[PDB]
Amino acid sequence: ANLDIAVYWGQNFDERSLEATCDTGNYAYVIIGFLNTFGGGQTPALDISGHSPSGLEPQIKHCQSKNVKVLLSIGGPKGPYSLDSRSDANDLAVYLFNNFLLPPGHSENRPFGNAVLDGIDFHIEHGGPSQYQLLANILSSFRLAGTEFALTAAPQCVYPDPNLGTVINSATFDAIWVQFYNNPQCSYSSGNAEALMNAWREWSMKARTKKVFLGFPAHPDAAGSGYMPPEKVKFHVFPAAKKSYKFGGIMLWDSYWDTVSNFSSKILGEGW
C-alpha cells in the first residue's frame, strides 16, 4: 500500500531511543509527547518520561536527515494543562514559535537546543474548546509568515470531538490521527469492527482536513481497549480505508509498545 505510519515517542524512560526509532525506517512522523503543563499561571513544562530534553537535539537532527518529520505534542492523556484566557493562548503560541519552530535567537533558551521541529500536535484531552481555536489561529498565522511547519490533532473517536471539534471544523489541521481506542463506542471490539467502521466512515467524510490517519494501540497492554491485531487491520480496514481520498495511513500508540510487539513491522511486511 506504501504506508505512512505516525508514532508517539517519549512515554517511557527505558524506551528505544529517538534515533533508533527513526532508524527503523517504519515511520514517516515521530511525535514527541508531551508539553503537558501550561496555562492558568504555570510556566510550560515537558513530561517526556525523564529523557534529557537537550540530549534530544542531535537525535532530532538525525531523524530529520533521514526524512522523518518530528513534531512536539501539546497536552496529552494527563497533565495540568488548560488554555482558558486569550492571554494564555497568545503566550503559548509565542513560546512554541520562538523555542521550537524557529531557528535560534542566540540569548533566551530552548528545550531541545538548536533543533527546529517540523510541527505541533494538539493532543488535547480535557478542558473543552476553550481558546484552542485562538491558539491555532495564531500558529497558523506564523505558518503564513514564512515558518513552514505542520499542525496536527489527535481527537478521540466520537464525532464531533468535545475538545477539538470546533477547532477541527476550521480546517486548520494538515492531518488528524483519530484515536480508535479507549472507547468501545467507536473502536475495535469482540471481533466486531462494526463500531470502528462506522466511526471511520463519519470521520473520513466529515473531518475538514486533507489527511485522516487511523490510530491504533501497538499492543494489548498499550490501551484499555481497542487493540486490533495487524492481520485484521490489513484484511478488514485497509480495503475500505483505501477507498478514501482522505486516507493518510495509521498512527500507533506508541513507540515503546511497538518495539515490543513489532506491530508496524507486521503491517508493512517487514519495514526494513
Q: Could you please report the per-residue DSSP string of the chain?
A: ----EEEEE-S-TTS--HHHHHHTS--SEEEEEEEEEEETTEEEEE-STT--TTTHHHHHHHHHHTT-EEEEEEEESS-SB---SHHHHHHHHHHHIIIIIS---SSS--TTTT---SEEEEEE-SS-STTHHHHHHHHHHHHTTT---EEEE--BSSSSPTTTHHHHTTT--SEEEEE--S-TTTS-BTTB-HHHHHHHHHHHHH--SSEEEEEEESSTTSSSS----HHHIIIIIHHHHTT-TTEEEEEEE-HHHHHHH-HHHHHHSS--
Active site residues: 125
What was the experiment behind these coordinates? X-ray
- Quote the CA–CA distance of 58 and 199 in Å, as a whole number: 39
- Quote the CA–CA distance of 260 and 34 in Å, as a whole number: 21
What's the CATH number where 171 sits? 3.20.20.80
List the grid coordinates of 129.
474548546
**Is 16 within 8 Å of 259 (Cβ atoms)?**
yes
- Quote the CA–CA distance of 63 and 61 in Å, as a whole number: 5
Cβ-based neighbours of 45, under 8 Å, separated by 6 or more: 35, 36, 37, 38
CA 14 vs CA 11, 51, 77, 255, 261: distances in Å: 9, 9, 19, 11, 16
- Quote the CA–CA distance of 31 and 215 in Å, as a whole number: 13
Q: How many residues does the chain have?
A: 272
List the grid coordinates of 242.
483505501
Chain-centroid distance of CA 168 in Å reads: 14
Could you tell me which residues are beta bridge partners of residue 103? none
Domain limits for position 205: 1-272
Instruction: Give the type of residue at 81.
Output: Y
Domain count, the chain: 1
